[PDB]
Amino acid sequence: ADEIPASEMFLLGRPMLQARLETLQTSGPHYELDYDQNRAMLATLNVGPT
Amino acid sequence: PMLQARLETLQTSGPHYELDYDQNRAMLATLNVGPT
Amino acid sequence: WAARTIFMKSQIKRQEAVAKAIYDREVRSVELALKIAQQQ
């Protein structure tokens, strides 16, 4: 229904996995919230202290 | 066919690693770069 | 009080920046997926 491990990933279908490949290829690596918070923190540190 | 494709994908895909493995590999890389 | 309001202003600006980055990334991915799906 959602995910059966990499041991089984052919069960879904060929158009299925093909669109899967193209969306992974066209979408960047998945990042978490901590990455965005750290990026904002780096930005406000790079703005310099008044 | 189900279990046969299962066998072939296990054979052709390496052992499953967790996130800790990748973090440790990155840590080893930045330790191997040496201290400036 | 002045220090506190400055701190909250900075926090709010940071949150807007994070949300803008996420929204831009999502919209770029969505448009590019549209083009790809249109191709197939």
Author numbering:
A (entry chain A): 252 to 301
B (entry chain B): 266 to 301
C (entry chain H): 202 to 241
Give sentences from the paper.
The enterobacterial common antigen (ECA) is a carbohydrate polymer that is associated with the cell envelope in the Enterobacteriaceae. ECA contains a repeating trisaccharide which is polymerized by WzyE, a member of the Wzy membrane protein polymerase superfamily. WzyE activity is regulated by a membrane protein polysaccharide co-polymerase, WzzE. Wzz proteins consist of two transmembrane helices flanking a large periplasmic domain; there is no cytoplasmic domain.
The 3.6 Å cryo-EM structure of full length WzzEPA that is found as an octamer with a large enclosed central periplasmic lumen connected to a membrane cavity defined by the transmembrane helices. The reconstructed 3D map shows only WzzEPA and that WzzEPA forms an octamer made up of four dimers arranged in C4 symmetry. A prominent conserved feature of the Wzz monomer is a long (approx. 100 Å) helix, which is approximately parallel to the long axis of the molecule. This helix is connected by a helical turn-containing loop (residues 241–265) to two shorter α-helices, which are arranged approximately anti-parallel to the long helix. In the octamer, there are slight structural differences between the monomers localized at the loop that connects the long helix to the two shorter α-helices and this resulted in C4 symmetry. These helices connect to a region of structure identified as motif 1, which is formed by residues 58–204 and 310–317. In WzzEPA, motif 1 consists of a β-sheet with four anti-parallel β-strands and four α-helices. Two regions within motif 1, a loop (residues 153–163) (L-loop) and a loop–helix–loop (78–100), point into the large central periplasmic lumen. The transmembrane helices, which are not closely packed, enclose the disc-shaped cavity within the membrane resembling that seen for other Wzz structures. The location of the antibody indicated that WzyEPA is positioned in the centre of the transmembrane cavity formed by the transmembrane helices of octameric WzzEPA.
